Amino acid sequence: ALPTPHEIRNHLDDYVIGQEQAKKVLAVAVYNHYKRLRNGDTSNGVELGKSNILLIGPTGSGKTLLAETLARLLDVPFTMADATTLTEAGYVGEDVENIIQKLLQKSDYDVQKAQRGIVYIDQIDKISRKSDNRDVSGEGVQQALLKLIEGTVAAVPPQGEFLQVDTSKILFICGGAFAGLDKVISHRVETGSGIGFGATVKAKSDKASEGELLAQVEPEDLIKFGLIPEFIGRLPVVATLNELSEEALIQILKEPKNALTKQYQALFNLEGVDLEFRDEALDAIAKKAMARKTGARGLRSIVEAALLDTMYDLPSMEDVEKVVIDESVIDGQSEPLLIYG
């Protein structure tokens, strides 16, 4: 009884911010995974639906973060693979069995402990079907993962005969960033616009928001993207993430220990100078961040773009003990204040 859905959401809140709905979904699926394996196929209900996860969100939304923060809190091992280096037919790039090999290294070759492990994959969009231009990075890779997800056994050389390791009990988290998916959903939901007086006048973009647009997604929508329907059928769960809120970004710069403010703060403390960031400058940065349409990953651009001149002349400058950054410095047409003595 180690995992608690009410507690697992509290722990992720410490390392992740801005995604409340997605955290609830993972707690249910994760709890249902071990609840099932506690009594495997012994209940009266036969043909129980398999529990998997499908993370869908924009860039910098925290998809990769949930996979890492979850493994730290969790006891069973965790792996972080990628679909970009995967090939088929034993080519020079990589094989699907490598994911099972890396799992044992984390578990020290414990099959009983490895079957209860977690799996995570990034950049699932790369394996999306494409028209013929041979195409090895595509449908072929999906077939290997499909038979692997549906439950089977794969030969694994122990320590480098082969060992059989069932996979119907192992969890899989296929997650990545889908590009152009919003356009596909728009065609289905928009259904045109009226032109007369009584018609619903449309502005430039009243629905171009991942939130309220991805929640209405369906499995058939992903088929047009390139994925196989049978592959999606094995993942009934879906997790829709929204673009980070401007207020949420502020919290990322203050509460997390790895905040960019704390990073540059220590960067100048070793140099013998203090640093400060007022609240009026944080919200201003959030306005510029959303305009870039990159997420928290593209937040560092606004910071270094401002402190470029300051850092250039700080080592040469002497007798400077503290630096204060005003809101005008971020908007422009101003210079950060410097403290001497």
Ligand X SMILES: Nc1ncnc2c1ncn2[C@@H]1O[C@H](COP(=O)(O)OP(=O)(O)OP(O)(O)=S)[C@@H](O)[C@H]1O
Ligand Y SMILES: Nc1ncnc2c1ncn2[C@@H]1O[C@H](COP(=O)(O)OP(=O)(O)O)[C@@H](O)[C@H]1O
- The answer to whether the CB of 26 falls within 8 A of the CB of 171 is no
Per CB under 6 A, contacts with ligand X among 151-180 are: 177
Stretch that binds its own copies, among 161-169, 172-180, 223-231, 319-327 (CB under 8 A): 223-231
Residue 54 touching ligand Y (CB under 6 A): no
Binding residues for its own copies, total number by CB under 8 A: 69
Per CB under 6 A, contacts with ligand Y among 252-291 are: 252, 256
- Phi first, then psi: what are they for 252, rounded to 5°? -65, -30
Judged by beta carbon distances under 5 to 8 A according to partner kind, the member of ligand X, ligand Y, its own copies, none in contact with residue 270 is: its own copies
CA distance 306 to 335: 9
- The answer to whether the CB of 170 falls within 8 A of the CB of 117 is yes
Q: Where are the alpha helices (DSSP H) in 39-138?
A: 63-73, 98-107, 111-114
- Shortest CB 14 distance to ligand Y, Å: 10
Q: Where are the alpha helices (DSSP H) in the chain?
A: 5-15, 20-38, 63-73, 98-107, 111-114, 139-149, 181-190, 219-225, 229-233, 246-254, 260-269, 279-292, 300-306, 308-313, 327-331
- Shortest CB 280 distance to its own copies, Å: 24
CB atoms < 10 A from the CB of 144, how many? 16
Residues that bind ligand X in the complex, under the rule CB under 6 A = 16-19, 59-65, 122, 177, 252, 295-297
Residues that bind its own copies in the complex, under the rule CB under 8 A = 4-6, 9, 24-25, 27-28, 31-32, 35, 38-39, 42-49, 80, 82, 84-85, 89, 93, 98, 102, 105, 122, 131-132, 137, 139, 143, 147, 160, 218-219, 223, 228-230, 236-237, 257-258, 260, 262-263, 265-267, 269-271, 294, 297-298, 300, 304, 308-309, 311-313, 315-316
